[PDB]
């Protein structure tokens, strides 16, 4: 098969004739079919039982439900038994003679249409009672619902005026219509003056334990009675749409009609084809239809009386800047009290519990406009509406709260504010600091061993720690990252300015040392600047490490209530900066190494000439720079220090190998240069091992440079047949300084000639490049990185 030949490959992953591994491979197939039949077993069982209940209930309802509608053949065909038999008496004279006077409702319509005129003219004040509450009307379950039933007796002139639509006469709704002017709208609007003044009376801060009880009881009685009443009229168009649109829209008319059907199919003709589905008989039977807006259409004015009192309590200024939700959420507390008080009053309607969430539309929509733009206090924009979001949540079910959706755009306003503010802050703090550091007689914040902290950087520390209190205070993935990481771009502008003006500190000590001991024909205006750059630039690296303290240590110290993704998005650009927290040391402290130097450039090129060969130039270099690392040594930050003295032994050996191209013929002749490589090697040893005390770097960060010491002793002292292996070994560590240095060494030498430079130094050039294909495919550029000295014609 197309699987089996592939399965012949799967078992042909056992060999070709592999009967033991064919057996085991068959056991693997048995494991696969084993579990596939466990899950296919139980799954097939569940499907089978689903078919079992499926056909079991298709059975049970085919038979039993066929005997449920056929049990309606049993009991409903039993309904047809006593159709013209029952009630053992003159039922024919009960439904056609005693019920003939049921078609004789004349005098009740005259004294009740007339009494509906006069007494509801009286109930236009009595059942429309107000001024002020006295329990809301007084007693609007007596009063406003007396206007509801007086409007339900005038629902003969309001709802059964729509049932009596040309029943038998013309003045049943005309001469009684002036009896319905003071009859219907002096009872229905009396129930709506008592209903709008009931719910308005229920909008009156208590409101009350009997006023909202009676008033809301009328506004649930005539509210839900109105709901089933107009639901019985809409179910007279839906029971007529069920009934007359099963008659007119059978379809067997089949025109259908013009124009009392489609439209109004199906209503369809009042009294009684359009009425008796809401009228007699009809054990209701009007439908009621009181009161329409007791709270059937007037419960929206209660939750919109706390959501129009709430929305009215905004006072859109916001009366300090965001006090809209103060009085508005106060009306939300009155919405919870009026809500639960009214559900204690009225179960069916009249503000059961919707006043709370309607007032959450009042506080939500209210707080989403007081700080829509930056028109409120932009520093206090999201804290107010968010404080009412979570607090007005916690003041309720959490839920008459302030849903805002403008939190995050206002957090972009906090982005622009805190970021551009910290551009202003950071710029002033920088230029203040650097203009302090050019005053080189007093160091910053006191300690006598150069571990000084700073002042404006402390304002960055503590005061930017206070800038991110809204960041961590609201736990934003867009500010506590974004102000922090855009702030890290601001820190990149910082360390660029520490490179710039700390390089101007370097220039200041360069020409101040020109003023000190370096031939004073160099003097600049801003460089009147003696020794003392040590405490300044190390004070910088110290608050690089204290930017590690509050930036790194506060960073991972507080930010622990997101996942490590967003916490990590913070962590990408505050704590890799530890490398950055010596990267200024990549630019400051190398300047320190040259400013240990710049009082001493008179021996720095008189090396390789005859003065240093038997004199005290090595004394000045080694001992003076030794003391220069006998005062930076107490005064230096550690991460700056290891890299520092590392680059002191390195840079001081390349200032010990400065003058390899001055072409002074080497005094290995009478050993004057050679003692300058050997006896001065003792003097240039405690420049490595008295510079370094308190640690064991004395040769450890000097061994790599004893390579260029001893192999350079093999380069520049030794004769013809001992400069080959000089470039062998010196190639085996330092190919960064290339072969042509030896050419300069044979520029500084007569008694190893230029054809010897061809054989030794050019076959050794082939050693250099072919070993660079061989062994470098030695180590990095170093102190001897780009000191490939000039070569002649090989």
């Amino acid at each position: 098969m197309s699987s089996d030949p592939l399965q012949q490959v799967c078992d042909l992953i056992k060999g070709d004739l592999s009967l033991e591994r064919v057996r085991d491979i068959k056991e693997q197939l048995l494991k696969e079919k084993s579990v596939v039949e466990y899950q296919l077993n139980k799954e097939s069982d569940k499907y089978y039982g689903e078919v079992e209940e499926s056909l079991k209930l298709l059975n049970l309802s085919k038979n039993s439900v066929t005997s449920i509608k056929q049990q309606i053949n049993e009991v409903n065909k039993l309904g047809n038994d006593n159709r013209f038999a029952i009630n053992r008496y003159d039922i024919l004279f009960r439904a056609t003679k005693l019920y003939e006077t049921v078609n004789t409702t004349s005098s009740i319509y005259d004294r009740i249409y007339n009494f509906v005129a006069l007494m509801e003219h009286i109930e236009r004040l009595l059942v429309a009672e107000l001024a002020e509450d006295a329990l809301e009307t007084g007693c609007p379950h007596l009063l406003e619902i007396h206007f509801l039933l007086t409007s339900a007796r005038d629902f003969q002139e309001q709802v059964v005026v729509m049932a009596k639509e040309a029943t038998e006469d013309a003045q049943r709704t005309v001469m009684k219509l002036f009896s319905r002017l003071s009859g219907i709208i002096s009872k229905f609007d009396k129930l709506l003056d008592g209903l709008t003044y009931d719910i308005v009376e229920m909008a009156r801060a208590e409101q009350i334990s009997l006023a909202i009880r009676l008033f809301k009881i009328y506004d649930l009685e005539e509210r839900e009675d109105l709901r089933i009443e107009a639901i019985r009229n809409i179910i007279k168009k839906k029971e007529i749409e069920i009934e007359k649109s099963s008659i007119k829209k059978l379809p067997n008319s089949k025109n259908t009609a013009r124009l009392q059907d489609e439209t109004p199919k199906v209503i369809e003709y009042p009294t009684n084809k359009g009425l008796y589905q809401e009228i007699m008989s009809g054990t209701i039977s009007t439908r009621t239809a009181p009161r329409g807006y007791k709270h059937f259409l007037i419960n929206g004015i209660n939750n919109s009386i706390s959501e129009m009192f709430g929305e009215m309590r905004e006072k859109y200024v916001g009366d300090q800047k965001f006090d809209v939700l103060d009085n508005m959420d106060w009306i939300f507390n009155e919405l919870i009290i009026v809500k639960e008080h009214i559900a204690n009053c009225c179960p069916p309607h009249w503000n059961i519990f919707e006043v709370y969430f309607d007032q959450y539309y009042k506080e939500l929509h209210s707080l989403i406009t007081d700080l829509v733009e930056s028109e409120p206090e932009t520093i206090i924009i999201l804290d107010i509406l968010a404080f009412d979001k979570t607090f007005q949540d916690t003041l309720k079910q959490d839920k008459s709260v302030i849903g805002d959706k403008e939190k995050e755009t206002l957090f972009k306003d906090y982005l622009n504010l805190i970021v551009v503010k910290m551009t202003e802050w950071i710029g002033n703090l920088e230029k203040a600091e650097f203009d302090v550091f050019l005053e080189r007689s007093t160091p910053p914040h006191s300690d006598s061993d150069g571990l000084l902290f700073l002042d404006g950087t402390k304002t960055c520390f503590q005061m930017f720690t206070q800038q991110v209190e809204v960041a961590a205070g609201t736990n934003q993935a867009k500010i506590l990252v974004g102000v922090v990481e855009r702030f890290s771009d601001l820190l990149t502008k910082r360390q660029k300015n520490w490179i710039s003006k700390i390089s101007e500190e370097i220039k200041k000590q360069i020409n101040y040392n020109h003023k000190y001991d370096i031939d004073p024909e160099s003097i600049t205006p801003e460089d009147e600047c003696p020794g003392g750059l040590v405490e300044y630039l190390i004070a910088v690296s110290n608050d690089q490490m204290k930017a590690a303290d509050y930036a790194v240590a506060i960073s991972s110290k507080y930010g622990k209530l997101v996942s490590k993704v967003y916490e990590k998005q913070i962590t990408n650009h505050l704590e890799g900066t530890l490398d950055g927290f010596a990267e200024v040391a990549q630019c400051s402290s190398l300047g320190l190494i040259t400013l240990m130097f710049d009082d001493l450039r008179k021996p720095y090129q008189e090396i390789f000439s005859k003065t240093w060969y038997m004199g005290s130039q090595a004394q000045q270099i080694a001992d003076t720079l030794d003391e220069y690392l006998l005062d930076i040594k107490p005064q230096m930050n550690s991460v700056l220090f290891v890299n520092f003295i590392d680059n002191v032994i390195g840079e001081t050996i390349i200032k010990f190998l400065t003058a390899l191209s001055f072409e002074h013929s080497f005094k290995n002749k009478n050993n004057k240069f050679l003692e300058a490589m050997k006896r001065d090697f003792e003097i240039f040893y405690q420049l490595f091992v008295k510079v370094l005390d308190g640690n064991e770097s004395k040769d450890t960060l000097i061994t790599q440079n004893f390579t260029v010491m001893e192999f350079f002793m093999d380069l520049s002292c030794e004769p013809i047949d001992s400069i080959l292996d000089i470039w062998q070994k010196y190639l085996e560590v330092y190919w960064d300084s290339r072969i042509d240095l030896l050419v300069g060494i044979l520029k500084c030498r007569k008694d190893v000639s230029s054809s010897e430079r061809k054989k030794i130094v050019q076959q050794a050039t082939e050693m250099l490049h072919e070993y660079r294909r061989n062994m470098e495919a030695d180590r990095e550029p170093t102190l001897m990185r780009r000191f490939v000295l000039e070569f002649e014609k090989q």
């Binding site: 012949q8 078992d11 042909l12 060999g15 070709d16 004739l17 592999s18």
Partner: protein, 49 residues
């Protein structure tokens, strides 16, 4: 049935199959022409008459 077609083990079973079958026609006509009695015995040549 399984053809199979090819190596792994079938084919390179079928060599010893078909040559084992001509080996059984070899031993078959050996015992057939043994006491055919084209060699005479009870057997080919173990004389019992």
């Amino acid at each position: 049935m399984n053809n199979k077609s090819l190596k792994t083990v079938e084919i390179l079973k079928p060599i010893n199959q078909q040559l084992e079958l001509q080996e059984h026609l070899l031993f078959n006509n050996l015992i057939e022409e043994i006491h055919d009695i084209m060699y005479s015995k009870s057997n080919k040549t173990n004389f019992t008459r």
